[PDB]
Design a protein around this nucleic acid. Structure first.
Ligand code: ADP
Ligand code: ADP
Ligand code: MG
Ligand code: MG
Ligand code: MN
Ligand code: MN
Ligand code: MN
Lengths: 448, 381, 448, 356
DNA sequence: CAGAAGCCAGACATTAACGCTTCTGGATAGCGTCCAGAAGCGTTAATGTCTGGCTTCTG
């Protein structure tokens, strides 16, 4: 998943055909480098370019589309970002571009153009946005929700994984390592339970919609029949039909009351039969989940989280021996730190210091990336910020750990405003402003 | 001399959105009738006259009607301040209650007062101590500790009681008149008041405990208790009000008076069958005022739609259901699984068996649930 | 409102009792100070004592109570935190404490005991949580919600205001300034509309719930009536009895149908009139009003957000002249950034770098603090980590602007890790980390 | 026979986050002293004793202390229910108040005894006639007053007791629907409230306005802060008298430019009088409120004065605009047309009225 | 000018914001009653995405 090249145009502060490729000697020597410059020069921009080219979205912008597009540099015509990446043994190419109304500095925004293709093959694997997203997700093994917290750690949201609610935390572990059927079966179970419950409710509505004559009304009507019949036997033609007409009125009402009761009795028998089934349906729903994997998805993913924390423990011991991580006895998917020096303290991650929380998040990200090494291997990492909160006596250990990781084929590119690593890192991509003109540039070797 | 010992009226209290005005008025008229029958001279209430700082209007109307009706008998009334109530809400009527031969002692620092008998002779000496808010007796000091505050407050309240008892004794001088002292504090989770530190007064009126009882086994320290039940833990217990016989400056005896239960209450515990059996016993009698009932279900099964099933069970009887409870506390999780199992090679049947193993069902609904999940699984193949 | 003292014991990682007073040989002037030390050595804990003792809620832990008290350091059984602050020429005193069972390192917790008192007279004004938390807010003019984003920019939450939800921002603005009558109107118009809609319903259901005979059945009953009417004239006594009996059945059916029909016509007239009533409330509820007072409050807070941004621009011009905030025409009120260098370029706040976003958030928070100045004066601000991301020249300009602000009564405290800034700042409350035991210590002049 | 007339006491009114305890107590003490000095037979108040239906605690204490002090005088006090004031809080003490020789209020006329217990006159107790209790409403109130007058006349017969009528309403010909002025029943004296500004009405002394004895707003800070004395002679009216009240909190209103008002504040340059003067500020400049308040505070902090509110006489802060104005601004985006807007504004008025 | 790439105007699958309903922790308790807060599902207008007509530049 290591990135091979980058190409951007009119993105944020940067303006004009800046292409960098890691196949060259300075980046292929070791694969580890650093980026520096003034704030706002484009340090985050040249790292968000690959994120845009891969997933059509940035950590700072919810979406880019035919409307509300503002990532292009002010007063420019076309902005594009193209990257080349190698998954398994073959390299691919991802492309994104956007044009104004007529290349003028103002006007309507046009629909984006996206192309995902294999390098040196000429095969356009996808030509539409949704198809491109599906294909790139399938081939890379990384959706945006997995990439933005397993491969790239943007500033400000580095602690998001530790501070993520289980509703969004469990989905990542579900997407990784397969096993997507749990949420599906939970949603289907909830849907069928809702159907089997709403079918019973309408029977209750029919149950309470049938008018029933009261027993007092029933007896009073029956009593009138005897009165009408007895007065008849006491006999003229006028009162014959008079009693007889009232006799017919009562007979139908009793017949209708019996018919109303007859319909109710059958329906109550039916209601009783499917009531016993819906009881078990609700009981099952109470421990299998509802809608978007509300329950039992965390139950299934607890084992994956246990494996992830087991790997994170052994990686964090190598990083630094201050804390160990393990799952806490809570219903939610949570991990709590263990104080090695105290050897007994069991405290949640909410009380950690800023630097220790950053280190824990980095360790979790590294272990999570290494967990899925079996399928769609990941051999890259980027850190926008986080080293500032660390002191010099620990930042050195952090850099030593990153060097130990980079000793393998993994490539790590960090960004930091702290000058304590300007000599530790040999390669620096210097970025410079231009006389306060509102734009920025970099080394001429990468310009085109 | 006879005096009534009561407290914790809690006028205007809302009990699950149900008013207590009817039972409070019933108790007020019953107490007035008992006072007229027993020919009392002074009545003392030991705090918590109003449930909240700003009681509703009807509670104030009830209090005014009670004081007006008590004015007819000519007996004296003493009103103590609690912790729940408002000292300002008591003082706004303390000034005007003086003309009615009733005293409100909500404000701290009240001097001892002589309780006159019906014949005009001095009957007893009051020690009307309301609830002692820390803001009225102590001063804040820096350099403190976590537990030093409790000891300082205890010392301050003990000193206040000692000083007030000494002042009352020196005011009564040598006449053989009984000494009465009020109180609205708990007496022996390390927050209490030692029993032996009370001054050796003739009789101590202590409140703020809804269960009437004796403290330390000493006869002249008593808890009056609530006049009416205020929760479901005292529904089946009879409330009491104390009358005290005083003569020649010494206590003789006290007798408990049962409070009529105008609004009966009961609580139920058990599974569905037991609850239904206990609820159906009300079919014989017909309670014109509805009886308030509590349901405490202790079982493990689901009981789908409790709020509708209970309503259906109680629709045919004048039994007002107020609250329900179930033993819902339960935790669920996959165990360590030997630190080796993984979700990829694990089976959905195995995880379902593990999930159901945590539940207490064994075979009866277990087989039906397993068949149900097999049917659910079969529709995605 | 400014802070005059502080005390804590076993708060987070500071065993023993510590106390710092801002009335000593250090802190004699109102100059800005700083706190420095190794990362994770209780650097924020010194800033947590103020927040805990004031509002019973640390910026990290949601609440502290008889349960889930993760704040206390391990192997301890008691903690407390006291604050002495001054407002309007008079001083007060807040307090908080908690113990364990029998003063043991294990067992359940006791209910925390609090205190609010005046330092001059020595009396206490509050002793319960539910009243103290309101009395402190009434006295200082700011509760926890206004405190945490007006005078304490905690680490990682500096940009909270900019990225806060529009409902949260509207609630903050209305709570800080104005009267909640808009909120009550909005929350009550919706209740009236719901009542009108509910009473409108259950009348249509009653109208539809009564079964009516169709006109064909009405004619069928009428036809059978005349059919049974003719042969009775053509008529025997037994035949007359059964014939007239059937006549009564039809007559009562026609009688009840007319009665049922008549009732339905009555309901239609009420519903037809009520349909004229429902538009009275539907349009009102659509234009304004909602649950918890959202739409009307959000509409009303624009007029005060205009004033807030007007103050923010003036504040920011002397702090960072590259940007002027503006109130864009958005239904959900938001601040809009105008670029001076880029010839009045307009773009969303979300697409800003970390340092410039921090500057914008700080300017907005300062303007918010100075908006309530005419009522109550706030003379304290403790900005936490996040200030060090700036470049040296930009950081120097920010420090110079803070110094210029410090000419007023504001006693700014800055918590960060910049070496140049910590050298520049005269006063340093240094914290010394222990040699692996896990605890931290202050200077010997503060311990007691 | 002598009667003291007052109305619109409005106890518990938070005058812009302030209190009225000291001035209320001083006015009550003055009222008691004047009543004792003039040997007045009875006291009447035309409703609106409390600001709202849930008055603060100190208002109850003030009212109870006033009544207790009145007890030593031995006079008679009658209290009516105001418009904003709810009858629920007044009826609470009705039983005790009657025992304390005072009446509170559908009712029947009552005989007003003298200090020696002899019947002096008769009064007509009419509280705020709520629409639920009773075009159509005008006739309802008119013939209700007619029936009450008939009952009073039946009670009188040939007795020489003068008839006194009480009410809490506004009438035509008065300035800050309306019961017509000429429709008054022929009574010796009729007392009206609900209007803080005392003024002449009807050309005859049978109907008079006492107004309010305290300043309810800066607009009513004029000298017309009087309390009326009504005297009777052998069953006929003797004369009408007006009483000047003391002030324990002066009101000051300022208008003009910033320089002019700053010059005006120099009149109170370190006077150091014991009552802090409350200031109403009206500035015609275009400067924003949030910093013009700071400018005002840059000068008022040294003077012995207190600033209550700042107003611009004519962007802007919500305190400058009213609820009706902001709602009309909200309606700018919708089509007002002809009736939709009328119905919507009427419904909004109903909602704002039913909110409190 | 004839025709193609580009630009502008219509239906359909997500989606984010209230609102309702249920459930639960905290402030009080001699370890009990409401008050407020949080989670999860249902509605709905808004929106991005895919598909069908005009317009300027190349041959
Ligand atoms: N449309 C635009 N016009 C001008 N400047 C822009 C525009 N969009 C983004 N920018 C600028 O792009 C820069 C991006 O900086 P960024 O890479 O986020 O900085 P950092 O690496 O310090 O976080 C910011 O200075 C921002 O103001
Ligand atoms: N439950 C606990 N028991 C003991 N010590 C703790 C506990 N929770 C946190 N701590 C300590 O408190 C420290 C607080 O970190 P702090 O220095 O305030 O953060 P930052 O470095 O971001 O300013 C933690 O690093 C840890 O050493
Ligand atoms: Mg950055
Ligand atoms: Mg920190
Ligand atoms: Mn009690
Ligand atoms: Mn008035
Ligand atoms: Mn009125």
């Amino acid at each position: 998943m290591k990135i091979l090249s980058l190409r951007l145009k009119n993105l944020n502060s940067l303006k004009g055909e800046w292409k960098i490729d890691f196949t060259r000697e300075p980046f292929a020597s070791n694969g580890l480098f650093a980026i520096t410059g003034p704030t706002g020069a484009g340090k985050t921009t040249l790292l968000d370019a690959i994120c845009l080219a891969l997933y059509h979205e940035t950590p700072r912008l919810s979406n880019v589309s035919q409307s509300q597009n503002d990532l292009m540099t002010r007063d420019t015509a076309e902005c594009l970002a193209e990257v080349e990446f190698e998954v398994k043994g073959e390299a691919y190419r991802a492309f994104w571009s956007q044009n104004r109304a007529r290349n003028q500095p103002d006007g309507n925004l046009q629909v984006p153009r996206v192309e995902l293709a294999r390098c040196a093959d000429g095969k356009i694997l996808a030509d539409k946005v949704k198809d491109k997203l599906e294909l790139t997700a399938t081939l890379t093994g990384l959706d945006y929700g997995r990439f933005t917290r397993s491969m790239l750690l943007s500033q400000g949201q580095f602690a998001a994984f530790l501070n993520a609610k289980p509703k969004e935390r469990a989905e990542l572990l579900e997407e990784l390592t397969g096993t997507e059927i749990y949420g599906q079966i939970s949603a289907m179970v909830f849907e069928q339970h809702k159907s089997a419950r709403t079918e019973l409710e309408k029977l209750q509505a029919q149950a309470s919609g049938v008018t029933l004559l009261t027993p007092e009304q029933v007896q009073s009507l029956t009593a009138s029949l005897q009165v009408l019949t007895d007065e008849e036997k006491q006999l003229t033609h006028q009162k014959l039909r008079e009693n007889t007409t009232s006799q017919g009125e009562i007979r139908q009402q009793l017949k209708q009351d019996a018919d109303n009761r007859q319909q109710q009795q059958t329906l109550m028998q039916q209601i009783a039969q499917m009531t016993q089934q819906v009881e078990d349906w609700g009981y099952l729903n109470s421990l299998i989940g509802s809608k978007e994997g509300d329950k039992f998805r965390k139950f299934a993913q607890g084992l994956t989280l246990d494996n992830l924390v087991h790997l994170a423990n052994q990686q964090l011991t190598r990083l630094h021996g201050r804390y160990l991580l393990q799952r806490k006895a809570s219903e939610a998917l949570e991990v709590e730190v263990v104080d090695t020096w105290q050897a007994d303290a069991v405290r949640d991650t909410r009380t950690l210091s800023g630097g220790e929380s950053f280190l824990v998040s980095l360790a979790l990200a590294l272990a999570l990336s290494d967990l899925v090494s079996h399928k769609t291997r990941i051999d890259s990492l980027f850190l926008d910020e986080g080293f500032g909160t660390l002191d010099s006596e620990t930042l050195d250990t952090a850099l030593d750990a990153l060097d130990a990781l980079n000793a393998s084929g993994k490539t790590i590119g960090v960004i930091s405003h702290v000058e304590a690593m300007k000599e530790r890192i040999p390669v620096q991509i210097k970025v410079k402003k231009i006389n306060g003109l509102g734009y920025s540039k970099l080394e001429s070797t990468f310009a085109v | 001399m006879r005096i009534l010992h009561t407290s914790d009226w809690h006028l205007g209290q809302n009990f699950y959105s149900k008013s207590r005005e009817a039972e409070h008025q019933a108790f007020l008229d019953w107490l007035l009738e008992t006072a007229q029958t027993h020919q009392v001279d002074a009545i003392i209430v030991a705090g918590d006259v109003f449930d909240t700082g700003s009681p509703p209007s009807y509670a104030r109307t009830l209090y005014n009607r009670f004081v007006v009706n008590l004015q007819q008998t000519g007996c004296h009334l003493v009103v103590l301040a609690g912790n729940q109530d408002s000292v300002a809400t008591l003082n706004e009527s303390r000034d005007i209650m003086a003309f009615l031969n009733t005293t409100v002692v909500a404000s701290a620092g009240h001097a001892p007062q002589i309780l006159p008998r019906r014949d005009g002779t001095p009957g007893a000496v009051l020690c009307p101590i309301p609830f002692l808010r820390p803001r009225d007796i102590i001063t804040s000091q820096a350099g403190l500790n976590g537990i030093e505050k409790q000891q300082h407050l205890l010392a301050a309240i003990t000193d206040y009681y000692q000083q007030h008892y000494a002042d009352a004794c020196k005011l009564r001088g040598d006449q053989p008149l009984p000494i009465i002292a009020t109180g609205h504090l708990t007496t022996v989770t390390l927050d209490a008041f030692p029993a032996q530190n009370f001054p050796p007064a003739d009789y101590i009126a202590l409140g703020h405990i809804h269960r009437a009882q004796i403290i330390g086994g000493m006869e002249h320290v008593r808890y009056c208790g609530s006049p009416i039940p205020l929760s479901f833990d005292e529904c089946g217990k009879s409330k009491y009000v104390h009358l005290v016989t005083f003569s020649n400056g010494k206590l003789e005896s006290v007798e408990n008076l049962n409070v009529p239960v105008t609004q009966p209450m009961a609580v139920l515990k058990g599974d569905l069958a037991s609850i239904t059996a206990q609820l159906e016993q009300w079919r014989d009698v017909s309670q014109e005022p509805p009886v308030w009932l509590d349901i405490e279900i202790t079982t493990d099964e689901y009981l789908h739609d409790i709020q509708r099933k209970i309503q259906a069970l109680t629709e045919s009887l004048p039994v007002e259901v107020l609250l329900v409870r179930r033993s819902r506390e339960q935790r669920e999780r996959v165990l360590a699984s030997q630190q080796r199992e993984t979700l990829s090679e694990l089976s959905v049947e195995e995880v379902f068996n593990r999930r159901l193993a945590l539940e207490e069902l064994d075979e009866s609904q277990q087989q039906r649930l397993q068949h149900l999940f097999t049917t659910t699984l079969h529709t995605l193949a």
